[PDB]
Design a protein around this ligand. Structure first.
Ligand SMILES: CC(C)CCC[C@@H](C)[C@H]1CC[C@H]2[C@@H]3CC=C4C[C@@H](O)CC[C@]4(C)[C@H]3CC[C@]12C
Ligand SMILES: CCCCCCCC/C=C\CCCCCCCC(=O)OC[C@H](O)CO
Ligand SMILES: CCCCCCCC/C=C\CCCCCCCC(=O)OC[C@H](O)CO
Ligand SMILES: CC(C)NC[C@H](O)COc1cccc2[nH]c3ccccc3c12
Length: 440
């Protein structure tokens, strides 16, 4: 009665992995904006998950429901070699993304991989070539085979596939395959998050707060706006809005501008917002008393409301000068500014309180992409690390958790092959790709 119910759970686990990882590979193989260096490595781990969901998870489920091996000692040594290669290739791929992301975030390109799509393929090929050698050669050469009679009675028998390891293999293949890339991946991807938050500037802070639209839209207050919070005019005539745009750009825009055109406007509004402070005798001494992070928070207020508007905060600016952040915070929040834009004022005042980009944490579109790659890496660890800890622990002492726990923790690790396609649903580029393939 247990077996029937157990099989149906595993049958759905298999299909969830296969159809999930098919949809991921299918999207990158067809969609143009999805063909990127970082999404090429994502194809390498979705591949490992599909090979896992087709050649590993189905054979593993059978070995449990029938409690025996009905596929011979050849497919037993090949099945385990594929499994080990999938697990080794997945973390090394994640550690490669982690490293690639460190080099992309430190480089002046900030969110662009330095490797070309030709180098990226070689990196994936060298991952699958080398990880296939550390997985298939110590298994087909039988460097994994243990010396105890209980293990050799399972090595001679065709109805057994309990992967028995000697004390040496069990420690080496756990260290090189999982522990070494995990230590590097986490240490290096703690730095990709660290470098993104520290290199956050006023231009990203305002792209977060004012957004980006390349066509004239109505502001929060109700005046014609374009690009990144660039007020075209307060006039309620579209002809009076499309006139100011054609003059500010210097071409027949017809109510639409480019990313380059909008960026040129935004670099001019930010420079004027800084200028507007240095010319205003009220804001200028407060601009001196504020640090690099809090200076961007004042520029953020002057950019939105204006040099005159912000000078109106006579009590706040004073408490900001005296380094009394929290005393300024309460006064800045009991403002009509806070009530008009609560979401943005919550972020501006927190940056004033903390003096850190703690308010703009994973807010930029490029940063939610780092959080996504950060969840895939972290979730992997949540699934595989309990199996590996118990794996490396039972090399020291054999007799504690035995077979019943080892298989469960292995299946926590197996279920991780089907979770990555559900975490790609966070990315709008994949969200749009998935709904197109599934016809929704
Ligand atoms: C079952 C075992 C022995 C077979 C291993 C499967 C091999 C053929 C697959 C799985 C992962 C695959 C890679 C996944 C990622 C990419 C990105 C793609 O845009 C170009 C090809 C490339 C670089 C693939 C090459 C072939 C590859 C290495
Ligand atoms: C199984 C491996 C086959 C999948 C190949 C693939 O993912 O193709 C991507 C394409 O080359 C993108 O440019
Ligand atoms: C399901 C929960 C997955 C946990 C992933 C994780 O640990 O998160 C990484 C990082 O905090 C992302 O910003
Ligand atoms: C049912 C068996 C075949 N599957 C166990 C793990 O999924 C594979 O885990 C590993 C991945 C990479 C290297 C490894 N070395 C090991 C030594 C003992 C057990 C698992 C592993 C292992």
């Amino acid at each position: 009665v247990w077996v029937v119910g157990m099989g149906i759970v595993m049958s759905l686990i298999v299909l969830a992995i296969v159809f999930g990882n098919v949809l991921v590979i299918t999207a990158i193989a067809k969609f143009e904006r999805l063909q990127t260096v970082t999404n090429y490595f994502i194809t390498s781990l979705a591949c490992a998950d599909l090979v896992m969901g087709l050649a590993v998870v189905p054979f593993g489920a059978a070995h449990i429901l029938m409690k025996m091996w009905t596929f011979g000692n050849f497919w037993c040594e090949f099945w385990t070699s594929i499994d080990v290669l999938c697990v080794t290739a997945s973390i090394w791929t994640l550690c490669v993304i982690a490293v690639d992301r460190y080099f992309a975030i430190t480089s002046p390109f900030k969110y662009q991989s330095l490797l070309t799509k030709n180098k990226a393929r070689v990196i994936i090929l060298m991952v699958w070539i080398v990880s296939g050698l550390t997985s298939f050669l110590p298994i087909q050469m039988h460097w994994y085979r243990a010396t105890h009679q209980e293990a050799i009675n399972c090595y001679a028998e065709e109805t057994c596939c309990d992967f028995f390891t000697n004390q040496a293999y069990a420690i080496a293949s756990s260290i090189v395959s999982f522990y070494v890339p995990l230590v590097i991946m986490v240490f290096v991807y703690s730095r990709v998050f660290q470098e993104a938050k520290r290199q956050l500037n006023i231009f990203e802070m305002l792209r977060i707060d004012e957004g980006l639209r390349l066509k004239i839209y109505k502001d929060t207050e109700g005046y014609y706006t374009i690009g990144i919070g660039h007020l075209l005019t307060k006039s309620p005539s579209l002809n009076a809005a499309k006139s100011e745009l054609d003059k500010a750009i210097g071409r027949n825009t017809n109510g639409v501008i480019t990313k380059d055109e909008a960026e040129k406007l935004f670099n001019q509004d930010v420079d004027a917002a800084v200028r507007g402070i240095l010319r205003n005798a009220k804001l200028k001494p407060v601009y001196d008393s504020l640090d690099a992070v809090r200076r961007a928070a004042l520029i953020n207020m002057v950019f939105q409301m204006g040099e005159t508007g912000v000078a109106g905060f006579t009590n706040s600016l004073r408490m900001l000068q005296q380094k009394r952040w929290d005393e300024a915070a309460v006064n800045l929040a009991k403002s009509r500014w806070y009530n008009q834009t609560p979401n943005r004022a919550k972020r501006v005042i927190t940056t004033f309180r903390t003096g850190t980009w703690d308010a703009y944490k994973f807010c930029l579109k490029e940063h939610k992409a780092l959080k996504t790659l950060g969840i895939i890496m972290g979730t992997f660890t949540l699934c595989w690390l309990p199996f590996f800890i118990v794996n490396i622990v039972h090399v020291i002492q054999d007799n504690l958790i035995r077979k019943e726990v080892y298989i469960l923790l292995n299946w926590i690790g197996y279920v991780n092959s089907g979770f990555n396609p559900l975490i790609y649903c966070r990315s709008p580029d994949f969200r749009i790709a998935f709904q197109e393939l599934l016809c929704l």
